[PDB]
Amino acid sequence: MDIRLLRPSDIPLIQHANLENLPENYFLKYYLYHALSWPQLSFVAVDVSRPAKSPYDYPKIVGYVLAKMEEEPADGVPHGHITSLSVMRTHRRLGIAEKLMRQSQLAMVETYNAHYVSLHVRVSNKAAIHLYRDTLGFKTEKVEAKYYADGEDAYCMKLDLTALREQIAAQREKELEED
């Protein structure tokens, strides 16, 4: 599977992937609003070698991450939020969600100077919680009771991007030397 930046023309199949894999769904218009507000932050996984049944086949989306910057900074401190993340069941445990998350996080820092990134996850969502805590280094901030429509609590998790920011500035200095 290929990882690449979201395309507006990808939006129907992104929305469809969300409908298949997640109980939280949105109007297409809300996808537009991300794509047109922060086009640098959302990515898709594509099954590119899927043979085409038709001359008008769209790229087959098997994963996505939908991300935004928070319009209201906490203390005038810019931070990203993950609106939605899923991978088709048939394509899980190939590392896709990890790659998608790290691409989004990098653009959040570079383009928007993000200081951290946050998200909500169901408390019973083992798979997702291990991705965020164990692989990506999110810490848990609080529990939101009955956050989800069916009453399930959520963890609000947050990732400090200080390390990534400095890591970025370090590579910026090596380019400035070459410059």
Partner: peptide
Amino acid sequence: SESS
């Protein structure tokens, strides 16, 4: 994922 974000609620509603």
